Design a protein around this motif. Structure first.
Motif, PDB file in Angstrom:
ATOM      1  N   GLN D  34       0.884  -1.229   0.003  1.00 18.49           N
ATOM      2  CA  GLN D  34      -0.091  -0.031  -0.032  1.00 18.49           C
ATOM      3  C   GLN D  34       1.004   1.178   0.082  1.00 18.49           C
ATOM      4  N   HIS D  35       0.174   2.432   0.038  1.00 19.64           N
ATOM      5  CA  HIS D  35       0.834   3.606   0.215  1.00 19.64           C
ATOM      6  C   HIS D  35      -0.323   4.879   0.501  1.00 19.64           C
ATOM      7  N   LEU D  36      -1.496   4.955  -0.087  1.00 20.37           N
ATOM      8  CA  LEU D  36      -2.647   5.927   0.180  1.00 20.37           C
ATOM      9  C   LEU D  36      -3.198   5.508   1.569  1.00 20.37           C
ATOM     10  N   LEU D  37      -3.568   4.504   1.854  1.00 22.47           N
ATOM     11  CA  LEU D  37      -4.447   4.281   3.357  1.00 22.47           C
ATOM     12  C   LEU D  37      -3.772   4.968   4.206  1.00 22.47           C
ATOM     13  N   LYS D  38      -2.780   4.588   4.671  1.00 23.89           N
ATOM     14  CA  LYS D  38      -2.105   5.319   5.962  1.00 23.89           C
ATOM     15  C   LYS D  38      -1.683   6.683   5.812  1.00 23.89           C
ATOM     16  N   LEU D  39      -1.439   7.125   4.502  1.00 17.80           N
ATOM     17  CA  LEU D  39      -1.430   8.319   4.148  1.00 17.80           C
ATOM     18  C   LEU D  39      -2.589   9.363   4.418  1.00 17.80           C
ATOM     19  N   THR D  40      -3.854   8.669   4.120  1.00 16.68           N
ATOM     20  CA  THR D  40      -5.097   9.271   4.748  1.00 16.68           C
ATOM     21  C   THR D  40      -5.022   9.414   6.323  1.00 16.68           C
ATOM     22  N   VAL D  41      -4.330   8.702   6.721  1.00 13.96           N
ATOM     23  CA  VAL D  41      -3.972   8.766   8.358  1.00 13.96           C
ATOM     24  C   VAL D  41      -3.080   9.854   8.754  1.00 13.96           C
ATOM     25  N   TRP D  42      -2.023   9.893   7.940  1.00 12.70           N
ATOM     26  CA  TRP D  42      -0.901  11.095   8.161  1.00 12.70           C
ATOM     27  C   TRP D  42      -1.377  12.244   7.925  1.00 12.70           C
ATOM     28  N   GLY D  43      -2.527  12.362   7.264  1.00 16.17           N
ATOM     29  CA  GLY D  43      -3.367  13.712   6.995  1.00 16.17           C
ATOM     30  C   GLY D  43      -4.092  14.026   8.354  1.00 16.17           C
ATOM     31  N   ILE D  44      -3.624  13.967   9.241  1.00 19.87           N
ATOM     32  CA  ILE D  44      -4.126  14.361  10.509  1.00 19.87           C
ATOM     33  C   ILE D  44      -3.256  15.448  11.544  1.00 19.87           C
ATOM     34  N   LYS D  45      -2.093  15.080  11.834  1.00 19.04           N
ATOM     35  CA  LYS D  45      -1.241  15.869  12.747  1.00 19.04           C
ATOM     36  C   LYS D  45      -1.095  17.313  12.499  1.00 19.04           C
ATOM     37  N   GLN D  46      -0.699  17.475  11.060  1.00 19.08           N
ATOM     38  CA  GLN D  46      -0.498  18.678  10.646  1.00 19.08           C
ATOM     39  C   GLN D  46      -1.744  19.410  10.641  1.00 19.08           C
ATOM     40  N   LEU D  47      -3.012  18.942  10.296  1.00 23.04           N
ATOM     41  CA  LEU D  47      -4.142  19.957  10.729  1.00 23.04           C
ATOM     42  C   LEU D  47      -4.123  20.307  12.068  1.00 23.04           C
ATOM     43  N   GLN D  48      -4.144  19.216  12.849  1.00 25.15           N
ATOM     44  CA  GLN D  48      -3.981  19.507  14.439  1.00 25.15           C
ATOM     45  C   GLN D  48      -2.876  20.805  14.503  1.00 25.15           C
ATOM     46  N   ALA D  49      -1.754  20.643  13.898  1.00 24.00           N
ATOM     47  CA  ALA D  49      -0.936  21.787  14.075  1.00 24.00           C
ATOM     48  C   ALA D  49      -1.196  23.109  13.684  1.00 24.00           C
ATOM     49  N   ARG D  50      -2.038  23.333  12.584  1.00 22.99           N
ATOM     50  CA  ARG D  50      -2.418  24.505  12.096  1.00 22.99           C
ATOM     51  C   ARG D  50      -3.603  25.034  13.109  1.00 22.99           C
ATOM     52  N   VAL D  51      -4.310  24.065  13.331  1.00 19.12           N
ATOM     53  CA  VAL D  51      -5.632  24.527  14.206  1.00 19.12           C
ATOM     54  C   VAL D  51      -5.021  24.999  15.604  1.00 19.12           C
ATOM     55  N   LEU D  52      -3.752  24.210  16.059  1.00 21.40           N
ATOM     56  CA  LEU D  52      -3.154  24.969  17.668  1.00 21.40           C
ATOM     57  C   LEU D  52      -2.558  26.029  17.377  1.00 21.40           C
ATOM     58  N   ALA D  53      -2.051  26.232  16.385  1.00 27.40           N
ATOM     59  CA  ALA D  53      -1.334  27.631  15.979  1.00 27.40           C
ATOM     60  C   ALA D  53      -2.202  28.686  16.193  1.00 27.40           C
ATOM     61  N   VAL D  54      -3.547  28.758  15.207  1.00 28.88           N
ATOM     62  CA  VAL D  54      -4.393  29.535  15.466  1.00 28.88           C
ATOM     63  C   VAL D  54      -5.189  29.676  16.823  1.00 28.88           C
ATOM     64  N   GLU D  55      -5.174  28.581  17.471  1.00 30.00           N
ATOM     65  CA  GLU D  55      -5.703  28.605  18.946  1.00 30.00           C
ATOM     66  C   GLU D  55      -4.842  29.374  19.657  1.00 30.00           C
ATOM     67  N   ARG D  56      -3.378  29.271  19.759  1.00 29.33           N
ATOM     68  CA  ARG D  56      -2.493  29.773  20.546  1.00 29.33           C
ATOM     69  C   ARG D  56      -2.428  31.306  20.244  1.00 29.33           C
TER      70      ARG D  56
END
Ligand SMILES: *[C@@H]1O[C@H](CO)[C@@H](O[C@@H]2O[C@H](CO)[C@@H](O[C@@H]3O[C@H](CO[C@H]4O[C@H](CO)[C@@H](O)[C@H](O)[C@@H]4O)[C@@H](O)[C@H](O[C@H]4O[C@H](CO)[C@@H](O)[C@H](O)[C@@H]4O)[C@@H]3O)[C@H](O)[C@H]2NC(C)=O)[C@H](O)[C@H]1NC(C)=O
Ligand SMILES: *[C@@H]1O[C@H](CO)[C@@H](O[C@@H]2O[C@H](CO)[C@@H](O[C@@H]3O[C@H](CO[C@H]4O[C@H](CO)[C@@H](O)[C@H](O)[C@@H]4O)[C@@H](O)[C@H](O[C@H]4O[C@H](CO)[C@@H](O)[C@H](O)[C@@H]4O)[C@@H]3O)[C@H](O)[C@H]2NC(C)=O)[C@H](O)[C@H]1NC(C)=O
Ligand SMILES: *[C@@H]1O[C@H](CO)[C@@H](O[C@@H]2O[C@H](CO)[C@@H](O[C@@H]3O[C@H](CO)[C@@H](O[C@@H]4O[C@H](CO)[C@@H](O)[C@H](O)[C@H]4NC(C)=O)[C@H](O)[C@@H]3O)[C@H](O)[C@H]2NC(C)=O)[C@H](O)[C@H]1NC(C)=O
Ligand SMILES: *[C@@H]1O[C@H](CO)[C@@H](O[C@@H]2O[C@H](CO)[C@@H](O[C@@H]3O[C@H](CO)[C@@H](O)[C@H](O)[C@@H]3O)[C@H](O)[C@H]2NC(C)=O)[C@H](O)[C@H]1NC(C)=O
Ligand SMILES: *[C@@H]1O[C@H](CO)[C@@H](O[C@@H]2O[C@H](CO)[C@@H](O[C@@H]3O[C@H](CO)[C@@H](O)[C@H](O)[C@@H]3O)[C@H](O)[C@H]2NC(C)=O)[C@H](O)[C@H]1NC(C)=O
Ligand SMILES: *[C@@H]1O[C@H](CO)[C@@H](O[C@@H]2O[C@H](CO)[C@@H](O[C@@H]3O[C@H](CO)[C@@H](O)[C@H](O)[C@@H]3O)[C@H](O)[C@H]2NC(C)=O)[C@H](O)[C@H]1NC(C)=O
Ligand SMILES: *[C@@H]1O[C@H](CO)[C@@H](O[C@@H]2O[C@H](CO)[C@@H](O[C@@H]3O[C@H](CO)[C@@H](O)[C@H](O)[C@@H]3O)[C@H](O)[C@H]2NC(C)=O)[C@H](O)[C@H]1NC(C)=O
Ligand SMILES: *[C@@H]1O[C@H](CO)[C@@H](O[C@@H]2O[C@H](CO)[C@@H](O)[C@H](O)[C@H]2NC(C)=O)[C@H](O)[C@H]1NC(C)=O
Ligand SMILES: *[C@@H]1O[C@H](CO)[C@@H](O)[C@H](O)[C@H]1NC(C)=O
Ligand SMILES: *[C@@H]1O[C@H](CO)[C@@H](O)[C@H](O)[C@H]1NC(C)=O
Ligand SMILES: *[C@@H]1O[C@H](CO)[C@@H](O)[C@H](O)[C@H]1NC(C)=O
Lengths: 135, 461, 135, 135
Positions: D34-56
């Motif tokens: 595979q490559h795509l399936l766990k890549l659609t999981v990798w697309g979480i933590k950078q989202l969390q990061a951008r949100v946390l930046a706004v929050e801070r």
């Protein structure tokens, strides 16, 4: 940042203490600030909610901009309030109710009050602007 | 002296609001063992964390009858049955006949009209069709042709003919509902657990603890235990007969199953469809034979008359057996995930109750230990969901099954309540009112983070 | 929650054509405010855009702060319109041109106008010390 | 292109060496924008990061807000500093200190200073509104 104190933004916890008292609490509550599978699926919905909270907060913050207020938490304006709906006088408000009755004293007229805040804010620029517009 | 307008943000206020909500659910009760299954679908795993802060000095209005969540989760959930609408088998969309007198199996069963039967007037009128055969009990012998009837396949005459085959799951998983951001859920508490009007020890959560499905006509079961006694709930308890519910201290058991065996003879029928023609007579001697620890029932009624003395003063008071109509109205209801069944609340529940300076006459019995036994019916062809044109001939399961239950509450109505011996029956209610159970704890609110007031402060210009 | 005006923020659609009516009503133009496992991806990708749109909106808020117009909806400062900017004239712009035309006219001077704002704001701060530098 | 300490926190990760000119440059640095399936999981933590930046960032801007400034990437007050926390000559601070030295030669007076800022702000904006209050 920190674990949730039952409520996120809006930070509700001084609930139904006196309105007079609440102003101190509020200003202080500002001043401080399947193994992997379906659990990673879930890992969207709360984040989507986290974004919707920001959407609401910013959508609603924009309104304060229209009223000429900056998150400066005690914004005031020479629209008069003029007593005649609940009439209580000052202490007789702030030492009695919760804000969770001030709504039941007054909702409704709110929809005119936003307009008073708009047109008065436009007056507080216009009424200087026209005196500069003498030349 | 004079005043002016001022505005505040972060003001502690909310308003009650209709909305959708999203659901947490059990993390392992579905897994890779159940591909594409409706219980596996949609709503998320479980949250361990629901915190609170106290409403010190602070109280709120509630009304369980008014609240929208009953509809919120009356919607969503029934779509399991919409997913379960498998097509009719090629042999039986029409009202076929069947021929038998004794069973096609080695004997007709030890109890009632189990006289198993072949299809006969069957599309082509051909061996490939007429060789196929069904389990019998009761509604399956309904009249077609003349005397010496070739019996009616009754399932043809309603808008949906279908079967929810045994691959489908019906497990009552605990959902844990949480409100969207900026909404919040408020939880009522006090020993005065009435569930309408003002509430004192009201409390705050991001999500409810787990609450479970139930599918009963008369006795609620297998779920949320009460706080430490018994209580009654109604919309307007002054009413003559409008539905009443009772909530219980101590989960009295129902001690029975109907382990009458029929073998796993399913068939890849017709053009490559599937059917559940369960046959043979090993373990055929068996019946529901139901039982209850009588004292653990008796306690409720003998307390309940005191409770009713608060609502209906001094009168003699009464229960009678459940109201007539179809067997379902005539009965309490269950299926184990194995057979559809309906016990005789229309024989039971027959007691009067004295209520002067009383020390007598309030029960079935007193001072025997002993327990009791009760008798109960089966219906293998079902209007599988009430209030819809859907019907099924049920797929059976072999042997005894891991089933039994215990009772959380009664569904109730005050039939005949215009004369002394003040009368009641078990049953009544909407099918919805199953889900009233525990939900009296909650209401949903929307936060409103700003507000306006008078002040002495005149603004700059 | 709410519908769309070209974008979930900024709310183009009341184009107004003539800039006159549009500007003279700009307030109301915002003051009106596998079964399903692949629903992960069909949440992720628009979520990214949705977040990055809020980040774009924050770039705008940064510029508005830089010009000393935080939360304002109409704003002005010290800077003159000093003659060489196209001479289209007040009474001969709004009533006979559109916002899209006005950009297609004005596109040359953009960075220069922005720099003139930057300079003027930064001067306006320290200019008050001409009165207030008492120590 | 856009400024970067994090993806928009701290508008350059590299310090301009010196608490003088670098402070002026920060404002211009804010101006230039595979490559795509766990890549659609990798697309979480950078989202969390951008949100946390706004929050801070929004929690931070709220602290500026209660201090009665917003945007204003440098802002002035009416709070005194009584000639006794290091007293290094002001050119020598500007020319010889990074903030990553004021972090040690100064700092942890922070809570007191944040107090002075808030208390003075509220008391000042009440003074004008109290002097205006009579009718
Ligand atoms: C639901 O589930 C609960 C819990 O499993 C069941 O039990 C409750 O248990 C409590 C504690 O035992 C019961 O309270 C006790 O009641 C006794 C009887 O009270 C009557 O008689 C006395 C004289 O004995 C009268 O004064 C009184 O007015 C009543 O008429 C009392 O003897 C007990 O007294 C003890 O507690 C007091 C108070 O702290 C002490 O000071 C004494 O020293 C003494 O130790 C006690 O009050 C309670 O009655 C049960 N609840 C109910 C509602 O029954 C439930 O039985 C069960 N079912 C129901 C219907 O709730
Ligand atoms: C009230 O709450 C009780 C207690 O949870 C529920 O009864 C239990 O239900 C579970 C789930 O079915 C039983 O656990 C597992 O059952 C499998 C058999 O499935 C048959 O039974 C269900 C009904 O329970 C039918 O719907 C279904 O069609 C099947 O006919 C077993 O295969 C599992 O086996 C594992 O456990 C056993 C020991 O129990 C081991 O020997 C095995 O090796 C294996 O590890 C498992 O048993 C559970 O047994 C039930 N308990 C009781 C006391 O009945 C009620 O269903 C629930 N609802 C109501 C309305 O009362
Ligand atoms: C009607 O059905 C319900 C639901 O099935 C029954 O509810 C509850 O069932 C339990 C178990 O049968 C009863 O017994 C207590 O259960 C708790 C929880 O298991 C025990 O506490 C501790 O639990 C942990 C984790 O399970 C365990 O590691 C510990 O060893 C255990 N013990 C201790 C001392 O720590 C506790 O010991 C009891 O065994 C509950 O009493 C019952 N709930 C209530 C409120 O009564 C219900 O029993 C059933 N009723 C009938 C008559 O059928
Ligand atoms: C805020 O505005 C509403 C009107 O918009 C004020 O009155 C409330 O209006 C509703 C709708 O008219 C009333 O409900 C209706 O009452 C009649 C007569 O009792 C009944 O026949 C209808 O079936 C329906 O229930 C509602 O009772 C009324 N509420 C009150 C307390 O007067 C409302 O009062 C305004 N808020 C305040 C605090 O003034
Ligand atoms: C129906 O339920 C009743 C009530 O539970 C059962 O009767 C009695 O139940 C109590 C416990 O509730 C038993 O008490 C225990 O007795 C032993 C000695 O045998 C003692 O060591 C314990 O400390 C406790 O006191 C009691 O023995 C029991 N009495 C009798 C005569 O049965 C009844 O058994 C239940 N019947 C059925 C078939 O479910
Ligand atoms: C700034 O505004 C100008 C005009 O609106 C934009 O287009 C460029 O304008 C110049 C001057 O007209 C063109 O150069 C030459 O002009 C003469 C007279 O018109 C003509 O005879 C020549 O053939 C030649 O076009 C220049 O070519 C033209 N650019 C293009 C790609 O057509 C200019 O793009 C605007 N810049 C900005 C940043 O707004
Ligand atoms: C915070 O401001 C204080 C002055 O109010 C600064 O100095 C304080 O100095 C004492 C003595 O050095 C520190 O106690 C201990 O000193 C030894 C040797 O330096 C060290 O090994 C211990 O770990 C401990 O620090 C005292 O803690 C220190 N105060 C604080 C809060 O650090 C101090 O330099 C300023 N610190 C910062 C991070 O701004
Ligand atoms: C046992 O169950 C039957 C249904 O199979 C009950 O049927 C009727 O129920 C109503 C309400 O109690 C009565 O008015 C009818 O007279 C009953 N009909 C018959 C034919 O019995 C029945 O009531 C239950 N048995 C007993 C003895 O009550
Ligand atoms: C204020 O004056 C308006 C009319 O200008 C009147 O309708 C209202 O009742 C008065 N009282 C309040 C509290 O607004
Ligand atoms: C304004 O003045 C500058 C010189 O300071 C000049 O270059 C420019 O043409 C003038 N007009 C405008 C509108 O910029
Ligand atoms: C100012 O004086 C106070 C005592 O009045 C002292 O605590 C503080 O450290 C001094 N320093 C500064 C720069 O304010």
């Amino acid at each position: 940042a920190v674990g949730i104190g039952a409520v996120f933004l809006g930070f509700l916890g001084a609930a139904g203490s006196t309105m007079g008292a609440a102003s101190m609490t509020l200003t202080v509550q500002a001043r401080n600030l399947q193994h992997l599978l379906k659990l990673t699926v879930w890992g969207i919905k709360q984040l989507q909610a986290r974004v919707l909270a920001v959407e609401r907060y910013l959508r609603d913050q924009q309104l304060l901009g229209i009223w000429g207020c900056s998150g400066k938490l005690i914004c005031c304006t020479n629209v008069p309030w003029n007593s005649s709906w609940s009439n209580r006088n000052l202490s007789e408000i702030w030492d009695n109710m919760t804000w969770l009755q001030w709504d039941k004293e007054i909702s409704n007229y709110t929809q005119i009050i936003y307009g008073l805040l708009e047109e008065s804010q436009n007056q507080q620029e216009k009424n200087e602007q026209d005196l500069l517009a003498l030349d | 002296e004079n005043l002016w307008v001022t505005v505040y943000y972060g003001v502690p206020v909310w308003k009650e609001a209709k909305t959708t909500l999203f659901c947490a659910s059990d993390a392992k009760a579905y897994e890779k063992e159940v591909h594409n299954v409706w219980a596996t679908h949609a709503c998320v795993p479980t949250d361990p964390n629901p915190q609170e802060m106290v409403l010190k000095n602070v109280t709120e209005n509630f009304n369980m009858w008014k609240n929208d969540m009953v509809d919120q989760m009356h919607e969503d959930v029934i779509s399991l049955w919409d997913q379960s609408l498998k097509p009719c088998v090629k042999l039986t969309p029409l009202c076929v006949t069947l021929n038998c007198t004794n069973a096609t199996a080695s004997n007709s069963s030890i109890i009632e009209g189990m006289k198993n039967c072949s299809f006969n007037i069957t599309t082509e009128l051909r061996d490939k069709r007429e060789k196929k055969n069904a389990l019998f009990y009761k509604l399956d012998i309904v009249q077609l042709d003349g005397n010496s009837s070739q019996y009616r396949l009754i399932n043809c005459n309603t808008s949906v003919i279908t079967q929810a085959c045994p691959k489908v799951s019906f497990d009552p998983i605990p959902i844990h509902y949480c409100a969207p951001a900026g909404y919040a859920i408020l939880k009522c508490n006090n020993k005065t657990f009435t569930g309408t009007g003002p509430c004192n020890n009201v409390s705050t959560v991001q999500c409810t603890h787990g609450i479970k499905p139930v599918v009963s006509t008369q006795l609620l079961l297998n779920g949320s235990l009460a706080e430490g006694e018994i209580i009654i709930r109604s919309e307007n308890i002054t009413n003559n007969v409008k539905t009443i519910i009772v909530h219980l201290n101590e989960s009295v058991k129902i001690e029975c199953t109907r382990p009458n065996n029929k073998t796993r003879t399913s068939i890849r029928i017709g053009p490559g469809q599937w059917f559940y023609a369960t046959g043979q007579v090993i373990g055929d001697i068996r019946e529901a034979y139901c039982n209850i620890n009588e004292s653990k029932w008796n306690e409720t009624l003998q307390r309940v008359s005191k409770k009713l003395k608060e609502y209906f003063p001094h009168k003699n008071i009464t229960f009678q057996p459940s109201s007539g109509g179809d067997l379902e109205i005539t009965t309490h209801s269950f299926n184990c995930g194995g057979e559809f069944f309906y016990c005789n609340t229309s024989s039971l529940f027959n007691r009067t109750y004295m209520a002067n300076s009383t020390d007598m006459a309030n029960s079935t019995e007193t001072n025997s230990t002993r327990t009791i036994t009760i008798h109960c019916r089966i219906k293998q062809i079902i209007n599988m969901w009430q209030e819809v044109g859907r019907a099924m001939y049920a797929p059976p399961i072999a042997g005894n099954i891991t089933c039994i239950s215990n009772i959380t509450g009664l569904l109730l109505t005050r039939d005949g309540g215009k004369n002394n011996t003040e009368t009641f029956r078990p049953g009544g209610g909407n099918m919805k009112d199953n889900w009233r159970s525990e939900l009296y704890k909650y209401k949903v609110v929307k936060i409103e983070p700003l507000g306006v007031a008078p002040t002495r402060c005149k603004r700059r210009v």
